[PDB]
Structures are given as C-alpha cells and as structure tokens.
Design a protein around this ligand. Structure first.
Ligand SMILES: COc1ccc2nc(O[C@@H]3C[C@H]4C(=O)N[C@]5(C(=O)NS(=O)(=O)C6(C)CC6)C[C@H]5/C=C\CCCCC[C@H](NC(=O)OC(C)(C)C(F)(F)F)C(=O)N4C3)c(C(F)(F)F)nc2c1
Ligand SMILES: [Zn+2]
Length: 198
C-alpha cells in the first residue's frame, strides 16, 4: 500500500582507483555500514578524488568514470538512481537504457578524463582491483583481451574505462564476452556515444 512504499537508495561512492602515480591501486573510502547509511540519506560528505570511482548500491558494486565533467556508469548497475553528494541526492543528467548508460554531474573534486581522438586500437581496461588489462580494439564497441581470464576477475568492473596509450577515455566497460567462463573479449560504450549524448 501507499503509506509503506519504500524509496530506492542512492548510488554511493565507496572508493576509487588511484591512477595518479606510477602504481595503480584501489582505495576504499567508506565501509559497508556507512555506505548503507549514506545510500538512504543521499548525503555523502566525503572528499572525492580521481577519475574512476568505486560505487555501490544496497545490492551491487561496480565502477563509475568521469569524462568531460560527467560521472558515467552502466544502467544495469545504477538504474535510475540518484547519487549521494554533500548536499543530498543528485538526479541523473543522462539516462539511456538502450546504451546501458547513465551519467551524473561529476562530483566536486573528481578529475575528468579527456575523450580520445587518437583513433588508436591499443587500449587498456582498468578494473575495480586496479588491474590494467591490455585490450586490442576489434570494433566500434568490442575489444579482445591480450591475456584472457575468468569472468570472476572482471565482475564488478562495469562502468570502468578503456583508455588509449595516452590515457584518454575510449569507452566505458559494459559486458564481458564469455565462453565457458573465460572472458576473451569485452563490450564497451564508445566515448563517441557519450559525446553524442552530451
Ligand atoms: C533494462 O536495462 C538493463 C537491465 C540489465 C542489463 N544487463 C546487461 O548485461 C548484464 C549485466 C552485464 C555484466 O555482467 N557487466 C559486467 C559487470 O562487471 N557488471 S557488475 O559490475 O558486476 C554488476 C552486475 C552491476 C553490478 C562487466 C561484466 C563482468 C563480468 C561478467 C559476468 C558474467 C555476465 C556476462 C554478461 N555478458 C553479456 O551479456 O554479453 C553480451 C551482451 C551477450 C555480449 F557482450 F557478449 F554480446 C555481462 O557482462 N552482463 C549481463 C546489459 C548489457 F549486456 F548491455 F551489458 N544491459 C542491461 C540493460
Ligand atoms: Zn587518445
């Protein structure tokens, strides 16, 4: 009934992938209890840094990537949810279920990646464990892993970036191409598709 209808919580930033130095590593910035609390209130006072955030809902955890002032992630992770911020929940500025794509204004303090114009096919996928995985581009929205690995290692990395050799954003990781549990390839949202949405 109407009196007892629940509201879905916000997406919450719970960590980041540190790419600022010579070593990539994951950092947690909020534990599970604080994530649950922040999800209900939508008020996140933590300072945000970097380009790739680790994000969570009550039931899922995945990634989100800032490109040209927009924090982007996958619809199959975030749905239509708001994101927690220091002033309360922030409504999505982009929602496109057909591309599995959502976006919010980039959090204050984040840093954005620049959309790639290199036209290069030698890419790098960044995972939630701060693995940097070489990927050869194979089409507009597909790339092959130079070294395949079980889908377990990629789970939780949707919304993460594929980067070019110079560190520009080439796309957003969406899905794994899996055969008997091995990821030989990945599907991603090309940055051009983000640039159109903008
Ligand atoms: C109504 O709106 C909707 C609703 C639901 C939708 N569900 C969609 O796919 C779902 C979710 C997605 C996924 O697993 N994402 C990753 C991840 O890490 N997720 S996540 O962070 O853990 C988490 C789930 C957020 C927490 C990177 C993966 C890492 C490991 C793979 C595990 C094994 C799964 C293999 C699968 N493979 C596949 O379907 O490949 C196809 C597409 C057939 C191929 F590419 F081969 F053609 C695959 O990857 N996924 C199945 C898609 C789309 F398919 F677009 F993604 N749109 C939607 C639009
Ligand atoms: Zn580039």
């Amino acid at each position: 009934h109407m009196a007892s209808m629940k509201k879905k919580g916000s997406v919450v930033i719970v960590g980041r992938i540190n790419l600022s130095g010579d070593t990539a590593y994951a950092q947690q910035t909020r534990g599970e209890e604080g994530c649950q609390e922040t999800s209900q209130t939508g008020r996140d006072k933590n300072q945000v840094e970097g380009e790739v955030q680790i994000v969570s809902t009550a039931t899922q955890t995945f990634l989100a990537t800032s490109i040209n002032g927009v924090l982007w992630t996958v619809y199959h992770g975030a749905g239509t949810r708001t994101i927690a911020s220091p002033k309360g929940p922030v409504t999505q500025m982009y929602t496109n279920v057909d591309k599995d794509l959502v976006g919010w204004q980039a959090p204050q303090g984040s840093r954005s990646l620049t959309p790639c114009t290199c036209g290069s096919s030698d890419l790098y996928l960044v995972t939630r464990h701060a693995d940097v995985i070489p990927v050869r581009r194979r089409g507009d929205s597909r790339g092959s892993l130079l070294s395949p690995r079980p889908i377990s290692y990629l789970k939780g990395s949707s919304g993460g970036p594929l980067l070019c050799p110079a560190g520009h954003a080439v796309g957003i990781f969406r899905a794994a191409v899996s055969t008997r549990g091995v990821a030989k390839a990945v599907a991603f949202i090309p940055v051009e598709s983000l640039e159109t949405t903008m």
